[PDB]
């Protein structure tokens, strides 16, 4: 609904969601933007925060601005930051490796004081890499993403602990800021108040308060009330500004000499000269709104403020008295409570804007170093901001952050799903935030304020759980990086349309109420007693009057991927969290099939997943060929889209897009006008439609396993194209250069036919495991020839042609066509790496069909492997003779809690025979609340169930009991949702009725053939000589520890010797053994491994004599 | 689906146990119990509603039914299971361990 060329997918909503889905992409578009400067984060400020603009770079260089000299005689202010346009498009700098960037360009003013003079420029700053329309960089000329990062936001926390040996309650803060240093005042053991400073051995207040200009008389004034405070001043044991301050000197900086202007001079350093301290505009804002010090004051004055430090003191020490409220003179009143280091309030997103900027800054800060070192060393009356900036730590900083980095990940893109979600991801485990043995248990739990802002269901089930997760379907993040949410307001008990955004610590202040409740069409409740939310994620039934916000939609909680499974509220959390984890794994299938039963994500999750060809504007297609469309955009203008006709995805799968329009169709703006991968008329398909049985077939379908019909395999409803990459270079030796050419040392012309001329094969060979893709010759020099060899050279007049042969061969069981060759030459003047005369890609490709091993999944976790693709006639069918395509088993549905597949199966087959609501005698109660056109149904017509708003068991009853017949007088599913099946082998129908229907289900990217390894003997490990690891090299399977414990266990010593002698390490005894193999002879004895022989040397050679005496 | 029966007596049972938990709560709302010992009294009121729930159920099926012929044959899944497919699924525990 609301894109011109939506598939006509009737809803089962009883709800009416008022706010669209939003750009799911925002989270890192605005992002950027907002780092650049761009117009529309512009114009988007002075909708919402126009009080000033924050251009990124801009922030930067105006805290930076200006690098003043020590002796404050010359000035730098790099100002107004300017982008360029990129060097190259899209599309040409993935193919030909460049980055996709964009020129840096600022004007730099270097200023003389003591003289007088302004010398501007235009300083090209660097080379910025640049977001796509898709939020991906295409730094290197893969396609990385940014992943948004979650991390503990600059504020004061106070929080209380308890002490067993006294059992009293301990509070304390902390107001860890940016780029500044640690401070706590803490309530101890007795009735005093450490006030620790960075870090060294705490303090009584009475020593700051009076070093912060607050007399014993000034500090009994404000903190009367505070009858601890008023202890610890009775308990103060100094008294004075100047002594104070000269014993924190002496402390803080120990036996530094408390002479009385460095330490004054020290306090503002640390605390109140900005340059050593810097909480940021985030933290401001936060602890503002802690202390309620400013409302209409705009967010600025990045630097402690001690009329700050004075209220921590007495809010503290109120906690402590156990108050409720606070009024700080100058300011509204606050309220009296600790924090929660979840709790989303107090954990921001450092998006993909802040990131860079903070990288940024890394740079700007190393290069202002150097800028100021030169200009000293610089003689005056000659220099030039040209001759002061050295570009190179940006550069670097910005390479160093883009590549090589944590956060900074490979878009993972099986499916366009898959793409969509590597963005939108949180994730806690980056740099500045908490390794995954650093992880506090507490940090993976879902805290009540997840709801809306994380989704509690959808993280990886490995051992990251909790640690990454995504952002939910209508989140939206603050400026200042807090996870806003939408909500709606309601008023005098009349919900309004009028939809606004709060943070978590709003949503702990007011009310929320539920969006399944019976708003009476004017916006008022109908029953008093109403579900709702209170501050500490209690729930409880509020009249309904004291309701002041209610949830915008259902399915609000939930994130995109999750959104996506039908009949998800019936699931159980573990089997959905898996569904939502493998959702993202399917593969693009040849044809691409919608799914028969679907939420109201499968087209709002491929249009802007950026894997579909929109329209921009209006128009009407001209020419539609599988590589262009030209679209006539009404006023004159004309435009050719261009496909991406079989293009190598970042994991070896297709990216075809086909056009779903004719020459001549009318397109309006934002329709959808190409399928991309895994879609088909707009709407999200990863897999296909297949008929589901529910029996246990002849132990087959044992634990987990699937069985399919030959029909899947036949008649190509599943199988992915998978498109592998192979690259040689012809790199420059010492010995001389190495040449792709046709001929080779001992190549015959057998095995040659394939290569054309230049090296490469001719595009469409099929080559299979051990074909020259690439001729390449090195030399080698004169080596001894072996007399035998010498001889058979000789007989046989083969000459040596000493250059020797390293051509690329396609690795092991990676079989298929050639589908393009790319050559890359220093001739051309390509920038290879130096030392490359020539890069040749080959791209070959095959057509995987599924086979036995291959994973398959539903939709709701029940995944499993393809224990037998069973013939068509040996495949239990129905009355009408129509095989099933797959058979589940049962045992895995009862016990594992995800009944999901069990209705979707039903509704499946509803919405394929059709219905036909039997309301002749009017719309049975069974439809009562079931919308219109819904009453009757076609044979394969499209449905949909919102997540949380979807089809009420009972409708599903009905609508199985109302379907019409196929082509004779034949209801094959009988109310119950079951079927009378034959048997296809032995012929007898089954005894009993059995649950047919159509469930999707997907292939997932675990096929066989990338798994199945084997090793005889192949390449050895350099330093210690195992065999190596690893199917990208032959490796075998590390025979680990408990293995060895295993077989200890059953005795077998003579086994064990072997696998840790003879198939290992014992180097002169595994040629042995290959020679007594082929020779037919006793595998010799084993000998020492090369394990203990190592650790013998290292052992002579870290001077401790370790030797071995029989007696 | 028609094959996972609910029991008919269960909204009797949960408005009996929920006049219980609007006593309980009132009693706390009048000051005559700290916030500790009612939410102790509601989760023993739910613990015995979860009972009783399962215990219906338990005697409504037959022995054909096939989750619980799957149940009672020893071949997998305990009962409570069977109470969480149909019927009430309980007290869910809190981040901290807590009920």
């Known amino acids: ?1111 | 689906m028609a094959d996972v029966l609910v029991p008919p007596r269960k909204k009797e049972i949960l408005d009996h146990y929920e006049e219980r938990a609007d006593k309980v709560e009132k009693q706390f709302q009048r000051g005559a119990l700290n916030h500790d010992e009612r939410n102790e009294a509601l989760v023993e009121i739910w613990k015995e509603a979860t009972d009783e729930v399962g215990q219906a159920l338990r005697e409504h099926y037959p022995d054909d039914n096939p989750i619980i012929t799957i149940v009672d044959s020893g071949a997998t899944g305990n009962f409570t299971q069977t109470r969480t497919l149909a019927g009430m699924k309980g007290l869910v525990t809190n981040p901290k361990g807590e009920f």
């Open chain 1, 1 to 1111: 609904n609301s894109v011109p060329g939506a598939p006509n997918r009737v809803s089962f909503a009883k709800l009416r969601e008022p706010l669209e889905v939003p750009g799911l992409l925002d989270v890192q578009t605005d992002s950027f933007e907002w780092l650049i400067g761009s117009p529309r984060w512009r114009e988007s400020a002075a909708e919402r925060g126009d009080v000033n603009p924050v251009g990124g770079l801009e922030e930067v260089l105006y805290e930076l601005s200006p690098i003043e000299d020590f002796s404050g005689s010359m000035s730098l202010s790099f100002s107004d930051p300017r982008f360029d346009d990129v060097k190259a498009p899209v599309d040409e700098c993935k193919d030909k490796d460049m980055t996709y960037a964009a020129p840096l360009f600022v004007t730099a003013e270097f200023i003389n004081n003591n003289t007088g003079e302004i010398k501007s420029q235009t300083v090209f700053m660097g080379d910025f890499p640049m977001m796509t329309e898709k939020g991906t960089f295409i730094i290197n000329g893969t396609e990385r993403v940014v992943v948004s990062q979650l991390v503990r936001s600059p504020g004061v926390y106070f929080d209380e602990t308890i002490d067993k040996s006294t059992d009293k309650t301990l509070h304390s803060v902390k107001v860890i800021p940016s780029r500044g240093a640690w401070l706590e005042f803490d309530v101890d053991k007795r009735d005093t108040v450490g006030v620790r400073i960075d870090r060294k051995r705490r303090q009584p207040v009475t020593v700051l308060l009076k070093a912060l200009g607050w007399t014993s008389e000034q500090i009994v004034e404000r903190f009367g009330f505070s009858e601890i405070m008023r202890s610890t001043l009775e308990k103060d044991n100094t008294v004075g500004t100047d002594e104070a301050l000269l014993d924190i000197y002496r402390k803080l900086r120990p036996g530094e000499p408390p002479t009385k202007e460095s330490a004054q001079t020290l306090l503002e350093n640390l605390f109140f000269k900005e340059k050593r301290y810097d909480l940021a505009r985030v933290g401001r804002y936060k602890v503002n709104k802690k202390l309620g010090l400013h409302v209409g004051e705009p967010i600025t004055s990045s630097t402690l403020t001690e009329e700050d430090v004075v209220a921590t003191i007495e809010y503290l020490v109120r906690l402590h008295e156990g108050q409720t409220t606070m009024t700080v003179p100058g300011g509204v009143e606050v309220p009296v409570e600790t924090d929660d280091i979840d709790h989303f309030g107090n954990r921001r997103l450092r998006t993909v804007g802040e990131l860079i900027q903070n990288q940024i800054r890394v740079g700007m800060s190393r290069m202002e170093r150097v800028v100021r070192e030169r200009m000293t060393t610089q003689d005056v009356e000659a220099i030039t901001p040209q001759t002061l900036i050295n570009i190179r730590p940006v550069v670097a900083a910005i390479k160093e952050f883009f590549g090589t980095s944590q956060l900074s990940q490979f878009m993972d893109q099986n499916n366009p799903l898959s793409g969509l979600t590597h963005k939108r991801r949180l994730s806690a485990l980056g740099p500045g935030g908490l390794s995954r043995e650093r992880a506090g248990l507490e940090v993976r739990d879902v805290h009540p304020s997840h709801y809306g802002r994380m989704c509690p269901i959808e993280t990886p089930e490995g051992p990251n759980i909790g640690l990454i997760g995504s952002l939910s379907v209508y989140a939206r993040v603050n400026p200042f990086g807090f996870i806003e949410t939408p909500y709606r307001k309601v008023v005098d008990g009349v919900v309004s349309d009028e939809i606004v955004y709060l943070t978590a610590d709003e949503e702990d202040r007011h009310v929320v109420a539920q969006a399944n409740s019976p708003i009476d069409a004017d916006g008022r409740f109908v029953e008093p007693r109403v579900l709702v939310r209170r501050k500490a994620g209690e729930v409880e039934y509020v009249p309904s009057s004291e309701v002041d916000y209610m949830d915008v939609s259902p399915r609000q909680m939930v994130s995109v991927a999750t959104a996506m499974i039908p009949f998800l509220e019936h699931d159980d959390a573990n089997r959905a969290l898996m569904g939502a984890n493998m959702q993202r794994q399917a593969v693009p299938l040849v044809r691409s099939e919608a799914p028969l039963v679907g939420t109201g994500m499968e087209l709002r999750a491929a249009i802007d997943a950026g894997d579909v060809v929109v329209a921009e504007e209006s128009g009407v297609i001209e020419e539609v060929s599988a590589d262009y469309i030209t679209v006539m955009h009404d006023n004159g203008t004309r435009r050719t889209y261009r496909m991406r006709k079989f293009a190598r995805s970042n994991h070896g799968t297709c990216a075809n897009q086909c056009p779903i329009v004719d020459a001549g169709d009318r397109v309006e703006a934002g329709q959808v006008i190409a399928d991309g991968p895994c879609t088909d008329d707009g709407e999200m398909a990863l897999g296909k439609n297949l008929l589901v049985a529910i029996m246990p077939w002849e132990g087959h379908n044992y634990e987990d396993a699937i069985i399919l019909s030959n029909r899947l395999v036949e008649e190509d409803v599943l199988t992915s194209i998978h498109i592998e990459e192979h690259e040689i270079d012809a790199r420059d030796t010492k010995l001389g250069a190495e040449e792709i050419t046709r001929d080779i040392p001992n190549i015959s012309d057998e095995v040659l036919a394939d290569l054309d001329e230049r090296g490469i094969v001719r595009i469409g060979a099929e080559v299979r495991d051990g074909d020259i893709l690439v001729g390449k010759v090195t030399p080698k020099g004169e080596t001894e020839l072996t007399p035998e060899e010498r001889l058979l050279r000789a007989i046989f007049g083969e000459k040596a042609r000493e250059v020797r042969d390293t051509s690329l061969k396609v690795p092991h069981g990676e079989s298929g066509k050639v589908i393009g060759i790319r050559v890359f030459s220093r001739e051309d003047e390509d920038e290879l790496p130096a030392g490359v005369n020539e890069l040749v890609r080959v791209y070959v490709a095959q057509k995987r069909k599924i086979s036995d091993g291959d994973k398959l999944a539903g939709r709701h976790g029940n995944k499993g492997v393809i224990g037998k693709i069973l013939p068509v006639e040996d495949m239990p069918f129905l009355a009408d003779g129509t095989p099933v395509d797959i058979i589940l088993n049962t045992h895995g549905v009862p016990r594992r809690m995800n009944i999901g597949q069990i209705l979707e199966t039903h509704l499946g087959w509803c919405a394929h025979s059709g219905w036909k609501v039997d309301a002749a005698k009017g719309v049975p109660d069974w439809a009562a609340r079931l919308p219109d056109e819904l009453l009757e149904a076609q044979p394969n017509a499209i449905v949909s169930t919102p997540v949380f708003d979807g089809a009420q068991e009972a409708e599903l009853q009905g609508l199985l009991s109302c379907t019409l017949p196929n082509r004779d007088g034949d209801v094959l599913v009988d109310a119950d949702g079951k079927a009378m099946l034959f048997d296809g082998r032995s012929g007898e129908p089954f005894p009993y009725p059995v649950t047919v229907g159509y469930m999707y289900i997907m292939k997932l990217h675990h096929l066989v053939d990338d798994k199945i390894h084997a090793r005889s003997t192949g390449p050895y490990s350099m330093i210690t000589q195992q065999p190596l690891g690893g199917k990208a090299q032959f490796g075998g399977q590390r025979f680990g520890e408990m293995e060895c414990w295993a077989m200890q266990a059953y005795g077998a010593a003579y086994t064990l010797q072997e696998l840790l002698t003879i198939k290992s390490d014992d180097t002169v005894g595994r040629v042995k053994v290959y020679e007594a193999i082929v020779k037919g002879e006793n595998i010799p004895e084993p000998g020492i491994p090369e394990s203990f022989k190592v650790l013998l040397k290292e052992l002579q050679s870290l001077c401790l004599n370790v030797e071995v005496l029989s007696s």
